[PDB]
């Protein structure tokens, strides 16, 4: 499923997500965006043979189990076709779990390079929550 | 409350070889970057060679390809450094660095390495190599 921008703030919202140890809800939006377009079923397969899945692009050889990364771990406890539902409460649930391990939203590439300092308000001005 | 310890260094006739290793303790998850950068007394410090724990894809400045390797023994969060012909301008101070994140998504330890150490947030206290002529 492609969310449209408000329809995915919406439903971050609705899990929680806004000011979630201080990322007001444009961080999460924006992080998602660049990550992967708003495509709950975006999946980039990477040379080490991990592969990043859904909304926000978690990796299989640290958050999730896809049974094809070798010596992994499964920090978030769950299947990685779990985060390429239309229901992003699993990748939501992750995503708490990765920005809660000790160097917050810099986890994410992608929000460290186009969101972090920016005005990401922006990302979720004209959306009605 | 994480620990590197270096080992190996020292000096050494140029044409010859060195293996420097670190090993990371304390740790419970991660690293998920280990990493050497060296700092001779007048010149830029320098990301020498990286690897993703998680992995094993190793990255080299160019001016190392070809003569350095770096390894990870993995089962001990410890990695290698093995150095083959040493040239004069390979002296320096060597460190051992790591990067604890977790990275939700894929990043390639060879990031950091090459802008500065970016994101190398654990250093160890530095191992001296000097190579003679």
């Known amino acids: 499923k492609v969310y449209g921008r408000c329809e995915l703030a919406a439903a971050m919202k609705r899990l929680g997500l806004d000011n979630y140890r201080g990322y007001s809800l444009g961080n999460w939006v924006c992080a998602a965006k660049f990550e992967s377009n708003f495509n709950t079923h975006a999946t980039n397969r990477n040379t080490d043979g991990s592969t990043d899945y859904g909304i926000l692009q978690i990796n299989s050889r640290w958050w999730c189990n896809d049974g094809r990364t070798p010596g992994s771990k499964n920090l978030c406890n769950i299947p990685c076709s779990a985060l390429l539902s239309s229901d992003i409460t699993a990748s939501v649930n992750c995503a708490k779990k990765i920005a809660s391990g000790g160097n917050g939203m810099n986890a994410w590439v992608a929000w460290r390079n186009r969101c972090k300092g920016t005005d990401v308000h922006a990302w979720i001005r004209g959306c009605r929550l | 409350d994480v620990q590197l310890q270096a080992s190996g260094g020292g000096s050494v006739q140029a044409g010859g070889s060195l293996r420097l290793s670190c090993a990371a303790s304390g740790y419970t998850i991660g690293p998920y970057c280990m990493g050497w950068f060296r700092q001779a007394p007048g010149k830029e410090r320098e990301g020498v060679a990286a690897?993703?724990?998680?992995?094993?894809?190793?990255y080299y400045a160019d001016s190392v390809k070809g003569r350095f390797t770096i390894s990870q023994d993995n089962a001990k969060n410890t990695v290698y450094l093995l150095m083959n012909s040493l040239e004069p301008e390979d002296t320096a101070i060597y460190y051992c660095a790591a990067d604890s994140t977790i990275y939700a998504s894929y990043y390639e330890c060879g990031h950091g390495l090459s802008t500065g150490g970016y994101g190398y947030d654990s250093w160890g206290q530095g191992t001296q190599v000097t190579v003679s002529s």
């Open positions: 690897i993703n724990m998680g992995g094993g894809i190793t």
